[PDB]
Structure 1
Amino acid sequence: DRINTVRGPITISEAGFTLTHEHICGSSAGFLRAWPEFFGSRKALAEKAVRGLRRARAAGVRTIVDVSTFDIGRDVSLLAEVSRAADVHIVAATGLWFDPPLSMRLRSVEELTQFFLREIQYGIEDTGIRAGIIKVATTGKATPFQELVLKAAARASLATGVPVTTHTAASQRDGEQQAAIFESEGLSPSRVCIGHSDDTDDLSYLTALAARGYLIGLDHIPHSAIGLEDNASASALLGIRSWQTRALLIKALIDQGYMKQILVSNDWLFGFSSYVTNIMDVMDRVNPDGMAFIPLRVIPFLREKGVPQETLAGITVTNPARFLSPTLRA
């Protein structure tokens, strides 16, 4: 009935236009507190985020799902501050990404489940803020630990109704492996979003997962190093496929009849310490619209390509509400 946000619970109808895979900051556990100057200052980072969120709001965005986990250096207090200042709802996450420290890496599936349940039911750290989604990741074949992470995520999802969203090496078809693990735990595909899906041109892989009930996250739309092939680091991160090429996969999926399974986002950020120094500068040059990229550029583009405005609204409003709403299996 309600979705947990960093400012408290909201009703489903209050979500409105939602970006399902974003980040205020891409960092590491403890980093922001230990070396804020890496980002100018904590203040500068917050202001930058507020400005970006306000521009996105101007464009129609009401809610963003920040999928930063503990290992992504998620700072809920920062999230709460920025949500209040920008007047944009922000859903926080639990789960683990691909940079877990030893204290996490050595845990059993049972312990990991407890930790995820903690963040969802009790609250994150001592803030009382509860997570509204579980984030997991693989980058090719799952490691044995990654397998434990996926099982624990499925278990926490099963107990709480909270959805699961993932990071994948799409080109390697990681989605297939994740699905298999989740299913083995009895999790329903409809509670799972297979992210970074636009990173691949293989529609056969995407339609196959969609046919099974999975949500497909087309969240790297503005990710492109075209014009910067000069830059190896940027190139390795963003790829050389155009934003138009990525956006067209959205239309392809709709054309195949999977409009109800699609989730779109930018996978944007305002700070990024987990990569080469100065990567943010490069990114901001590439996509000055930041998180407003989807509503300002993608939507109109799709409309122009023949996608009905109504369909577009269902993808940006309806689908997310259905996904985000905590749902227990019968």
Structure 2
Amino acid sequence: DRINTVRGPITISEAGFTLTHEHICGSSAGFLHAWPEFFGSRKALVEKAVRGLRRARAAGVRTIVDVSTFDCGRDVSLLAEVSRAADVHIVAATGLWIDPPLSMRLRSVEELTQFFLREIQYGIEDTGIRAGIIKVATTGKATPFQELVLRAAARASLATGVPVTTHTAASQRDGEQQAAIFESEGLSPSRVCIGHSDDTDDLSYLTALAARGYLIGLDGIPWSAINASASAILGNRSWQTRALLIKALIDQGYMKQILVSNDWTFGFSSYVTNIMDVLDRVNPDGMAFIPLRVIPFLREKGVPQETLAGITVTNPARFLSPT
């Protein structure tokens, strides 16, 4: 009874192979509840999510961390249903993403701290489900509100021991501004993951954050566009280029600071209409891309099996553990 999941508290050993940055549905607050037909139906979305996590479990995955926040349309009741049906542990998230509504964006740091603490200590909505991770975001230079979210995330993390994970515009080196704000609040670097870090080839930026104790979120491995709307989100860099960054950080002695994931989803309303149809053709493996296509690739390049097992099992366990 260490890590909080959508099914209740589980132990460190029960976690196993863990994908640290995933989504069941990328949406907006109240959207799935108000317009389920957008995704065909709520039943069609549940079935697509259950089939996907079952194929991921058959490939080796035992736990996924759903980093969808309130404004990313997190519906913990959906997460609970798909978790139970697929028999895969799902860790829920609190925090705020890139689309906070007026009722969230006009709040103070004290109020946001109360909201984050409520979702971790009491529960999310009326479900009783407690969050086991805090997700925050910046897209370049932090807005005055985003600074308050990062400070509230840090204050909520120090009071509960629950980790913090971030969304970044990696090419603009956001991890450094996020890191500076977290440390100004007294938050330990070992409790933070700088996500979307595989969107850049700047190894100097990655190794420096890793040297301070930060976990590097190399979470968008299958995202490649090799269509203006699809190119702007997937990027023009291959999956191999993103995957070689895992090898590059191991070679420099930072195997303990790596967190790998797919940043996959089954429903996607916070982008263009038929993006889910384009995404499932680029990567038909889905969340099963890390154990099926990325792990045997790194084995062919010379990376040992024990260090890859240390990145997928030991690192997320230490990260998700309340300390």
TM-score when scaled to structure 1?
Answer: 0.98
Asked if residue 94 in structure 1 is aligned to residue 94 in structure 2, the reply is yes
Whole-angstrom distance in 1 between the partners of 2:206 and 2:65: 22
Q: CA deviation at 1:201?
A: 0.4
Whole-angstrom distance in 2 between the partners of 1:159 and 1:207: 29
Q: CA deviation at 1:64?
A: 0.2
Which residue of structure 1 aligns with residue 277 of structure 2? Answer: 281
| 1:64 alignment partner, SS class | strand
Which residue of structure 2 aligns with residue 296 of structure 1? Answer: 292
Can you list the C-alpha shifts for 1:101-132, whole angstroms capped at 9, x where unaligned?
A: 00000000000000000000000001100000
Give the length in aligned residue pairs.
323
Which residue of structure 2 aligns with residue 270 of structure 1? Answer: 266
| 1:223 alignment partner, SS class | coil
Q: CA deviation at 1:12?
A: 0.6
Which residue of structure 2 aligns with residue 37 of structure 1? Answer: 37
Whole-angstrom distance in 2 between the partners of 1:210 and 1:85: 37
Structure 1 runs of 4+ with >2 Å offset: none
Which residue of structure 2 aligns with residue 155 of structure 1? Answer: 155
Can you list the C-alpha shifts for 1:275-314, whole angstroms capped at 9, x where unaligned?
A: 0000000000000000000000000000110000000000
Whole-angstrom distance in 1 between the partners of 2:108 and 2:168: 23
Whole-angstrom distance in 2 between the partners of 1:124 and 1:274: 21
Q: CA deviation at 1:39?
A: 0.1
| 1:183 alignment partner, SS class | helix
Can you list the C-alpha shifts for 1:252-286, whole angstroms capped at 9, x where unaligned?
A: 00000000000000000000000000000000000
| 1:14 alignment partner, SS class | helix
Can you list the C-alpha shifts for 1:201-230, whole angstroms capped at 9, x where unaligned?
A: 00000001001110000001000001xxxx
Whole-angstrom distance in 2 between the partners of 1:219 and 1:97: 16
Whole-angstrom distance in 2 between the partners of 1:217 and 1:104: 26
Q: CA deviation at 1:164?
A: 0.1
Whole-angstrom distance in 2 between the partners of 1:193 and 1:32: 28
Aligned alpha-carbon RMSD (Å): 0.4
Whole-angstrom distance in 2 between the partners of 1:140 and 1:43: 37
| 1:302 alignment partner, SS class | helix
Q: CA deviation at 1:84?
A: 0.3
| 1:166 alignment partner, SS class | strand
Whole-angstrom distance in 2 between the partners of 1:208 and 1:238: 26
Whole-angstrom distance in 2 between the partners of 1:192 and 1:89: 21
Which residue of structure 2 aligns with residue 16 of structure 1? Answer: 16
Whole-angstrom distance in 1 between the partners of 2:213 and 2:11: 25
Q: CA deviation at 1:147?
A: 0.2
Q: CA deviation at 1:186?
A: 0.3
Whole-angstrom distance in 2 between the partners of 1:254 and 1:277: 39
Q: CA deviation at 1:171?
A: 0.3
| 1:210 alignment partner, SS class | helix
| 1:208 alignment partner, SS class | helix
Q: CA deviation at 1:139?
A: 0.4
Whole-angstrom distance in 1 between the partners of 2:14 and 2:95: 25
Whole-angstrom distance in 2 between the partners of 1:3 and 1:318: 14
Whole-angstrom distance in 1 between the partners of 2:147 and 2:87: 38
> Structure 1: which 5+ residue stretches go unaligned?
none
Which residue of structure 1 aligns with residue 240 of structure 2? Answer: 244
Q: CA deviation at 1:152?
A: 0.1
Q: CA deviation at 1:4?
A: 0.3
Which residue of structure 2 aligns with residue 171 of structure 1? Answer: 171
Q: CA deviation at 1:79?
A: 0.3
Q: CA deviation at 1:133?
A: 0.2
Whole-angstrom distance in 2 between the partners of 1:110 and 1:183: 18
Q: CA deviation at 1:44?
A: 0.1
Whole-angstrom distance in 2 between the partners of 1:266 and 1:60: 14
Whole-angstrom distance in 2 between the partners of 1:103 and 1:309: 48
> Structure 2: which 5+ residue stretches go unaligned?
none
Whole-angstrom distance in 2 between the partners of 1:30 and 1:122: 21
Q: CA deviation at 1:19?
A: 0.3
Which residue of structure 2 aligns with residue 206 of structure 1? Answer: 206
Whole-angstrom distance in 1 between the partners of 2:322 and 2:21: 17
Whole-angstrom distance in 2 between the partners of 1:323 and 1:150: 18
Alignment of 1:76-155 (within 5 A): 76-155=76-155
Whole-angstrom distance in 1 between the partners of 2:11 and 2:70: 26
Q: CA deviation at 1:184?
A: 0.2
**Identity of matched residues, %:** 97
Q: CA deviation at 1:174?
A: 0.1
Can you list the C-alpha shifts for 1:138-195, whole angstroms capped at 9, x where unaligned?
A: 0000000000000000000000000000000000000000000000000000000000
Q: CA deviation at 1:241?
A: 0.2
Q: CA deviation at 1:77?
A: 0.3
